[PDB]
Amino acid sequence: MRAVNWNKKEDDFSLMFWKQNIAQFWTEEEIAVSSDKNTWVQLSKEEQIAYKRVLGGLTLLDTKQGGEGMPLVLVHLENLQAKSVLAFMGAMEEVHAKSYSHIFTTLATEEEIDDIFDWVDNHPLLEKKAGIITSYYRRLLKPEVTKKELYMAMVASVFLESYLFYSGFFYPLYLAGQGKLTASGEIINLIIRDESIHGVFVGILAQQIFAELSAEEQQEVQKETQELLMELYEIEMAYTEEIYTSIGLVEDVNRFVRYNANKGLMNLGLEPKFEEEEINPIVLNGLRTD
Amino acid sequence: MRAVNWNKKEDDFSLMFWKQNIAQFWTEEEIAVSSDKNTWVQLSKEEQIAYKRVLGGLTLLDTKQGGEGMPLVLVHLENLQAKSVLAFMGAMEEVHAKSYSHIFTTLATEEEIDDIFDWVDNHPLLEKKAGIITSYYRRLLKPEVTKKELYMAMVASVFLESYLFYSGFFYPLYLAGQGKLTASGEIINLIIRDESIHGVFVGILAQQIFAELSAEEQQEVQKETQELLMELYEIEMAYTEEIYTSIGLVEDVNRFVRYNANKGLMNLGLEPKFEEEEINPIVLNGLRTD
Amino acid sequence: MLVAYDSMTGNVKRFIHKLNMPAVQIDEDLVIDEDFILITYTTGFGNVPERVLDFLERNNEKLKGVSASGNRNWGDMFGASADKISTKYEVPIVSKFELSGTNNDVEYFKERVREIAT
Amino acid sequence: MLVAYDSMTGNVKRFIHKLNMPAVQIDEDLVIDEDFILITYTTGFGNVPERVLDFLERNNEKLKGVSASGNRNWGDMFGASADKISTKYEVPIVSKFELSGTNNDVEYFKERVREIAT
Numbered sequence: 001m002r003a004v005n006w007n008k009k010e011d012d013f014s015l016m017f018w019k020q021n022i023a024q025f026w027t028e029e030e031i032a033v034s035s036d037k038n039t040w041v042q043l044s045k046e047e048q049i050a051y052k053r054v055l056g057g058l059t060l061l062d063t064k065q066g067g068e069g070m071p072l073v074l075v076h077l078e079n080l081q082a083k084s085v086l087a088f089m090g091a092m093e094e095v096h097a098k099s100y101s102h103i104f105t106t107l108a109t110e111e112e113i114d115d116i117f118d119w120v121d122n123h124p125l126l127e128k129k130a131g132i133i134t135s136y137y138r139r140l141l142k143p144e145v146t147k148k149e150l151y152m153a154m155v156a157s158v159f160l161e162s163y164l165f166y167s168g169f170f171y172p173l174y175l176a177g178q179g180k181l182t183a184s185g186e187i188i189n190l191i192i193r194d195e196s197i198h199g200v201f202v203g204i205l206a207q208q209i210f211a212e213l214s215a216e217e218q219q220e221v222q223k224e225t226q227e228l229l230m231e232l233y234e235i236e237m238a239y240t241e242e243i244y245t246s247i248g249l250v251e252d253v254n255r256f257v258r259y260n261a262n263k264g265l266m267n268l269g270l271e272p273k274f275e276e277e278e279i280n281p282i283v284l285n286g287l288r289t290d
Numbered sequence: 291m292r293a294v295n296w297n298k299k300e301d302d303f304s305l306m307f308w309k310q311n312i313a314q315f316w317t318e319e320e321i322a323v324s325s326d327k328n329t330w331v332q333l334s335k336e337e338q339i340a341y342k343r344v345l346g347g348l349t350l351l352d353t354k355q356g357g358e359g360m361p362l363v364l365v366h367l368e369n370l371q372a373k374s375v376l377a378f379m380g381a382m383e384e385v386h387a388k389s390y391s392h393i394f395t396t397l398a399t400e401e402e403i404d405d406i407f408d409w410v411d412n413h414p415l416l417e418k419k420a421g422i423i424t425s426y427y428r429r430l431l432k433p434e435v436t437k438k439e440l441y442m443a444m445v446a447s448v449f450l451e452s453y454l455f456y457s458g459f460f461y462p463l464y465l466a467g468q469g470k471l472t473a474s475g476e477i478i479n480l481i482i483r484d485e486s487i488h489g490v491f492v493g494i495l496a497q498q499i500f501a502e503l504s505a506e507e508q509q510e511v512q513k514e515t516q517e518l519l520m521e522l523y524e525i526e527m528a529y530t531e532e533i534y535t536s537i538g539l540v541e542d543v544n545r546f547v548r549y550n551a552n553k554g555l556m557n558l559g560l561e562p563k564f565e566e567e568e569i570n571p572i573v574l575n576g577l578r579t580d
Numbered sequence: 581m582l583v584a585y586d587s588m589t590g591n592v593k594r595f596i597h598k599l600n601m602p603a604v605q606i607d608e609d610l611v612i613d614e615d616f617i618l619i620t621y622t623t624g625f626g627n628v629p630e631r632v633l634d635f636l637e638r639n640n641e642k643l644k645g646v647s648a649s650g651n652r653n654w655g656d657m658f659g660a661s662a663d664k665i666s667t668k669y670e671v672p673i674v675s676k677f678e679l680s681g682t683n684n685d686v687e688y689f690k691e692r693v694r695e696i697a698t
Numbered sequence: 699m700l701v702a703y704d705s706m707t708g709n710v711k712r713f714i715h716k717l718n719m720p721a722v723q724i725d726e727d728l729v730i731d732e733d734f735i736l737i738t739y740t741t742g743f744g745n746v747p748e749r750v751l752d753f754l755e756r757n758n759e760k761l762k763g764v765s766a767s768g769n770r771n772w773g774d775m776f777g778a779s780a781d782k783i784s785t786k787y788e789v790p791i792v793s794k795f796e797l798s799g800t801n802n803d804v805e806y807f808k809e810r811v812r813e814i815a816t
């Protein structure tokens with residue numbers, strides 16, 4: 001039985017990702033969010049509700065990626081140096097999840113916070129969305145998995161990492177780019193930098209497996225990947241209308257969703273499928289300001 | 291579907307373990323081992339071979355615990371705050387594994403190092419030992435698992451964490467406690483402090499599940515736990531004779547194995563089963579000196 | 581002598597049951613009105629549990645000695661809770677032992693507590 | 699103009715195929731003897747790939763401009779490889795674009811390189 005040997009490289013990228021994960025390591029204790037209260041109270045009730053709701057959803061996705069996605073994908077790899085990077089990334093998914101609780105405990109009372117979590121757990125579109133993704137992961141709960149099964153879990157992963165989060169990340173960035181909740185914003189920026197490299201990494205691993213599939217399996221997973229992309233886009237449009245209609249931001253969020261979908265596709269070595277538009281400039285400012 | 295909410299505690303200990311994991315975070319880059327060469331060359335060939343062989347074995351166990359053990363145990367927990375801690379601990383198992391490569395690349399040439407890894411992969415007692423442990427983990431590769439199955443994977447875990455490593459940890463400590471390879475020794479000390487709290491944590495989770503078993507399941511897992519303990523002790527005595535006969539340290543290592551077995555049992559809330567003896571004082575000195 | 585203790589995972593509690601001297605698990609409101617020995621466990625980096633620190637603020641006048649449960653895996657931080665308490669309140673370290681303690685640890689403790697009751 | 703580039707995961711390579719200007723992927727021994735534009739990707743914290751830094755040590759005299767592929771998710775470190783290279787070798791930043799670039803990025807690049815060939 002093999003032990004991980006770093007003095008014999010198994011691929012040409014795991015070490016750099018190993019190192020960058022660790023270089024990126026941060027924890028919520030490093031960012032005080034108390035100072036956000038000054039801008040928090042100036043928001044409307046509708047803005048406040050949208051923010052908390054989106055943080056709920058972000059926390060759900062990180063929960064599942066740390067608790068299901070990285071574990072079930074990594075358990076089946078033969079590349080032990082890649083397995084290592086994925087374990088670390090899964091831990092970071094929990095670091096992120098906890099960082100949302102840290103934000104919540106300035107912006108809300110304990111009762112409000114628990115109400116949000118109950119809302120998340122009972123919310124049918126969130127259940128649906130997270131359930132489609134996690135069904136690719138739970139398919140790996142067996143001793144032996146096919147390359148196609150593993151490939152599709154990796155596609156699902158990259159879709160979550162690089163695409164599904166962004167309907168939520170939109171709002172903290174949008175406000176931070178207006179100078180509102182900038183502390184909470186800095187935390188989300190750290191999160192996104194982590195997730196960005198998670199998506200790249202899992203897309204690399206996916207492309208390796210794709211190259212090994214037969215021409216016929218390749219055609220099958222290409223079709224399945226387009227289907228999943230568009231099924232998720234359809235759910236995300238329903239989710240953005242729920243969350244953002246109240247504050248008039250639905251089409252802006254949908255545009256941002258498409259922009260990130262295209263990035264997720266490219267992480268898989270695939271062509272963009274949505275119209276190319278520039279990033280929302282206010283969101284961009286939220287990414288920059290620190 | 292539930293997201294992790296840290297503002298509603300799911301148990302009375304996960305937060306403290308979450309925090310202590312993070313407080314303990316270290317990486318190999320923090321400890322330069324170059325200065326060990328001065329004492330390394332003064333060792334005999336037989337001492338050198340034993341050290342490298344034991345590092346091989348340590349690397350194997352950390353590989354499997356990070357790549358199989360923590361992932362398959364955590365995927366099945368309902369306690370999301372505990373899941374979080376276990377993901378982090380699994381990442382740390384990979385940090386440790388890599389720290390052994392860092393040691394190796396001062397003490398050996400690339401060819402020597404790859405030879406050790408080949409030796410580890412083909413070694414029948416190591417295969418056997420790691421295979422008994424991992425068979426408890428691979429039983430969890432299915433959608434639904436019983437409390438008994440989960441309990442026994444957690445017993446296996448604690449046995450690996452708190453017991454199986456110590457036939458290997460003996461040697462770097464023993465030499466460091468003589469002032470030889472003290473840099474490599476400091477790395478092993480960091481590793482052991484991590485593993486020590488890993489064992490405590492998983493033993494807590496096991497005791498929770500035990501308390502939920504029926505009287506009859508309790509009797510069954512108690513028997514299975516004693517069997518596994520003693521099956522592993524039998525293999526460890528075969529392993530210690532292989533590795534340490536050449537340097538005359540077999541009974542010292544066996545004593546240390548028993549001492550740690552008893553600690554592992556207590557981590558499970560169980561009675562010691564080996565005679566109580568004080569720790570090897572030279573090993574103790576290896577633990578202290580920094 | 582009366583033993584006050586704190587136990588998180590059951591080890592200190594198991595030790596105290598090997599003594600059959602009278603002993604009580606500390607809490608927030610607890611006040612101890614007689615001479616006593618404290619047995620604490622040790623938290624990360626050789627530290628004192630918060631519950632013990634809070635207790636001792638209110639009960640240190642009658643504290644006559646402290647023992648710590650820890651794990652020798654922590655090296656120089658082995659049972660250093662006893663060092664911190666001993667220093668802060670100027671009482672002796674009775675003993676340090678690992679986990680639920682051995683029999684020699686039980687006998688040692690008993691002898692030291694007699695000695696200290698002098 | 700000749701384009702030298704480096705691509706780790708295929709994005710810069712995809713971009714260069716949208717240009718049909720002549721272009722070559724850099725390596726260790728490569729020497730470029732004519733005026734050229736460099737397209738690099740960006741490594742963590744806005745840094746320059748090592749392979750690019752090594753190349754440029756030997757070929758910076760003919761470097762006329764640098765573009766970077768990155769990802770706007772990196773905020774102020776977006777394509778900052780171009781900033782580092784521009785500063786070190788005193789050449790212009792041609793453009794910054796994300797991943798395999800958009801069509802506007804392709805046209806932009808083409809216009810800038812003409813402008814700079816002046």
Ligand SMILES: Cc1cc2nc3c(=O)[nH]c(=O)nc-3n(C[C@H](O)[C@H](O)[C@H](O)COP(=O)(O)O)c2cc1C
Binds near residue numbers: 590591625627650
């Ligand atoms: C998170 C954590 C940190 C610890 N830190 C230390 C330490 O610095 N020194 C020490 O001797 N023991 C330390 N230990 C070991 C405990 O003090 C030891 O297991 C003790 O027996 C626990 O007693 P209890 O079962 O009554 O809680 C630590 C244990 C845990 C779980």
Ligand SMILES: Cc1cc2nc3c(=O)[nH]c(=O)nc-3n(C[C@H](O)[C@H](O)[C@H](O)COP(=O)(O)O)c2cc1C
Binds near residue numbers: 197743
């Ligand atoms: C580990 C890592 C770190 C990165 N750091 C940065 C960064 O600091 N700034 C940036 O704009 N892009 C950064 N990126 C994004 C890449 O530069 C971007 O995906 C680029 O298109 C890669 O080009 P290639 O596919 O040709 O390698 C990083 C990507 C990875 C994988």
Ligand SMILES: [Cl-]
Binds near residue numbers: 066
């Ligand atoms: Cl989960």
Ligand SMILES: [Cl-]
Binds near residue numbers: 196200769771
């Ligand atoms: Cl990135």
Ligand SMILES: [Cl-]
Binds near residue numbers: 244
């Ligand atoms: Cl709207």
Ligand SMILES: [Cl-]
Binds near residue numbers: 269270271
């Ligand atoms: Cl495509």
Ligand SMILES: [Cl-]
Binds near residue numbers: 258273274275
């Ligand atoms: Cl479109």
Ligand SMILES: [Cl-]
Binds near residue numbers: 353354356358
């Ligand atoms: Cl493994």
Ligand SMILES: [Cl-]
Binds near residue numbers: 486651
């Ligand atoms: Cl411990």
Ligand SMILES: [Cl-]
Binds near residue numbers: 534535538539540541
């Ligand atoms: Cl011997």
Ligand SMILES: [Cl-]
Binds near residue numbers: 559561
């Ligand atoms: Cl027992």
Ligand SMILES: [Cl-]
Binds near residue numbers: 563
């Ligand atoms: Cl015995």
Ligand SMILES: [Fe+2]
Binds near residue numbers: 161
């Ligand atoms: Fe991620």
Ligand SMILES: [Fe+2]
Binds near residue numbers: 379383485489
């Ligand atoms: Fe461990």
